[PDB]
Amino acid sequence: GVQEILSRAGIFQGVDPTAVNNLIQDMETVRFPRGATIFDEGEPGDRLYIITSGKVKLARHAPDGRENLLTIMGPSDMFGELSIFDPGPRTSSAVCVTEVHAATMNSDMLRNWVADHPAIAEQLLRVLARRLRRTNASLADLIFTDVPGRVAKTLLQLANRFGTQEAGALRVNHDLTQEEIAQLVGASRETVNKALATFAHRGWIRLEGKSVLIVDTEHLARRAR
Amino acid sequence: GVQEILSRAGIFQGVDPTAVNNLIQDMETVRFPRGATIFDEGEPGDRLYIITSGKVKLARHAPDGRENLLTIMGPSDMFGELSIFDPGPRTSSAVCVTEVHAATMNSDMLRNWVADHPAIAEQLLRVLARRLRRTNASLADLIFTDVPGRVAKTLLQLANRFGTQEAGALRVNHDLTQEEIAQLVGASRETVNKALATFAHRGWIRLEGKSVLIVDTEHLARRA
Ligand SMILES: Nc1ncnc2c1ncn2[C@@H]1O[C@@H]2COP(=O)(O)O[C@H]2[C@H]1O
Ligand SMILES: Nc1ncnc2c1ncn2[C@@H]1O[C@@H]2COP(=O)(O)O[C@H]2[C@H]1O
């Protein structure tokens, strides 16, 4: 239910359960339709969001119109915190990939919570560190891996985040377009298409809409690195 | 003369000088010779560092052995926090470019600090948040900036960090080998040498061993 999903967000881990239930209760429930923009990169804001259902992509923009997708968040994930702790523009656009349900609060509310519960501040440090940890790997990936290996990685990352076991395989209803997968990878639409085709062609994965079955993890794993 | 250099670290910014002064004194010092590894990528860490003197490069490693440098840290810079707040292995090596002196603390001392002083907590959050903002930009530069644009950016970052006025021009004693420079930029030595020679052929920059003089910053800044 909504309170169990919210209770799993990093920001509440090990924190007093009671304080958690009460804090959840002062959060606002919102719902966005698919494709809605929650905020744009460069906007100022200090609202924070914790998703309870659906997927939100976080997009950054190059002067020439193009975009890379930093990541795709889903239920229990948090975004919006960064502008609070380092005041400044949104470091990306948050856009609903599906219909999205989230809990949200302003930064006054968050600050008061932290003042009542220092453990929150500690969990927030773990959250930003873990994000530096992941993003550093993405950067390494751009420096050291070829496009096909990067595509492979991206897919295994989607599988770990959103994958279901389905008749021996990983069902990954990622809901992304072809171009968006590419933006997630940080490479051209053609190369990324090429690699994807290759991987289907070998039987490693199976395309089927904005969804992928991943049937030999290890082969795809071998190909990344 | 360690106290003042340390008080210039991000973790203490705006924090009370006497609370800063008191906290500095629980920090434990270490010294390393030139070329030493303080710690390796994948090592489990428990220790935080703030450099008081000299330079540290933070490197990542591909299985086939090649290296990339995330950044170069000097006096006042803080590293090793990531493993403390997200327990897990080191996200890079730390290697001594020059002889390095540093103040350190382990994770139990830092948790105390974070739990006892909201302002230090706040500062740390600000430090990680700003590192995210910066890394995002690096990652975008890889995808969208041309190689010589990156060199230009890497030079000015070095100048922004270690630049000292000289002859109306910026003197930048970075202490790096061309390979290291290339590895900071994160591109083939061929491309990074060729872009360095160009800016020279002009007169934006002059090479000298492991030191650069940036004469006209304006145009270098422009080239980013
Ligand atoms: N590299 C990243 N990895 C994961 N999340 C990020 C990353 N960069 C930014 N974000 C999230 O994207 C949000 C965009 O708005 P803020 O900058 O307010 O806060 C940002 C973070 O919550
Ligand atoms: N993107 C980054 N920007 C600045 N410093 C970093 C970055 N990534 C890692 N580091 C520093 O390098 C240190 C390596 O050890 P830790 O992972 O514990 O902590 C890391 C950070 O202190």
DSSP codes of every residue in A134-169: HHHHHHHHHHH--HHHHHHHHHHHHHHHH-EEETTE
Using most ligand atoms within 8 A of CB, pick from B82, B86, B131, B132 the residue to mutate for ligand 1. B132
**Nearest atom within ligand 1 for CA of residue A91:** 17
How many CB atoms neighbour CB A121 within 10 A? 22
Q: Which of B73, B55, B56, B76 is nearest to B5 (CA)?
A: B76
The separation between CA B206 and the C-alpha centre of its own chain, rounded to angstroms, equals 22
* Count of other CB atoms within 10 angstroms of residue B178: 14
3-class secondary structure, B185: helix
- Of all protein residues, whose CA lies closest to atom 10 belonging to ligand 1? A79
Structure tokens at A119: 């453990």
CA A182 to chain centre: 15
Cβ < 6 A, ligand 2 pocket: A 132, 136; B 45, 58, 70-71, 79-83, 90-92, 131, 135
Q: List, in sequence order, every beta strand (DSSP E) within B1-150.
A: 28-32, 37-39, 47-53, 56-61, 67-73, 78-79, 93-96, 100-106
Q: ∠ CA(A121), CA(A157), CA(A13), 5° rounding?
A: 25
The tokens for A216 are 């030999």
| Cβ neighbours for B35, distance < 8 A, ≥ 6 positions apart | B95, B96
Distance CA A99, CA A54 (A): 6
Which residue has tokens 């751009």?
Answer: A142
**Helix axis angle, A118-144 to B118-144, nearest 10°:** 20
Tokens describing residue B112: 């105390």
Helix axes B147-162, B178-185, angle to 10 degrees: 110
Which fold is adopted by the domain B146-224? Arc Repressor Mutant, subunit A (1.10.10)
Which residues does A5 contact at the CB level (< 8 Å), separation at least 6? A52, A53, A75, A76
Helices (H), A10-85: 17-25, 82-85
Asked if B181 and B150 count as a contact pair (C-beta separation under 8 A), the reply is no
B118-143 b/e (C-beta count within 10 Å ≥ 16 → b): eebbbbbbbbbbebbeebbebbbbbe
Inter-chain residue contact A142 with B143, CB threshold 8 Å: yes
Separation CA B187–CA B210 (nearest Å): 18
CA distance A22 to B213: 59
Collect all residues of chain A within an 8 Å Cβ-Cβ radius of residue B154.
none
Identify how many contiguous H helices and E strands chain A contains and give both numbers. Answer: 9, 12
**What's the rounded Cα separation, in Å, for the pair B11 and B64?**
37
Hey, how many other C-beta atoms are within 10 angstroms of the C-beta on B169? 15
Nearest CA to ligand 2 atom 4: B131
Tell me the two tokens of residue B21.
Answer: 């002064």
Q: How does DSSP assign B18-50, residue by residue? A: HHHHHHHTT-EEEEE-TT-EEE-TT-B--EEEE
d(CA A158, CA A175): 11
Instruction: Identify whether the C-beta of residue B170 lies closer than 8 Å to the C-beta of residue B164.
Output: yes
Please measure the distance between the N-terminal and C-terminal CA atoms of chain B and give it in whole angstroms.
37
Give yes or no for a contact between B132 and B139, defined as CB atoms under 8 angstroms apart: no
Q: Tokens standing for B198?
A: 């160009």
In this complex, the residue of A60, A122, A138 whose CB is nearest that of residue B114 is A122
Copy the structure tokens of residue A54: 């659906």
- CB-CB under 8 Å, A136 with B131: no
CATH architecture of A146-225: Orthogonal Bundle (1.10)
List B residues 81-100 in contact with A (Cβ-Cβ < 8 A): 81-82, 84-86, 88, 91-92
Using a CB–CB cutoff of 8 Å, tell me whether B66 touches chain A.
yes
Spans of all domains in chain A: 1-145, 146-225
| Tokens read off for B192 | 């990074």
What are the tokens at A68?
A: 């890379």
**Beta carbons of A189 and A179 less than 8 angstroms apart:** yes
Q: Amino acid identity of B28?
A: E
**Domain B1-145, second-level architecture:** Sandwich (2.60)
Q: Contacts of residue A140 in chain B, CB cutoff 8 Å? A: 60, 62, 68
CA gap B217, A203 in Å, rounded: 54
Task: Write down how long chain B is.
Answer: 224
Task: Kindly state the helix (H) or strand (E) to which residue B221 belongs, with its residue range.
Answer: helix B217-223
Name the structure determination technique.
X-ray
Residues of chain A contacting B131 with CB distance shorter than 8 Å: 132
Q: How far is CA B119 from CA A11, A12, A120, B20, B126, in A?
A: 19, 21, 14, 11, 10
B214 Cβ contact list (under 8 Å, min separation 6) = B155, B156, B159, B163, B169, B170, B172, B204, B205, B220
Alpha carbon A46 to its chain's center? 19
Contact of B10 with B78, CB cutoff 8 Å: yes
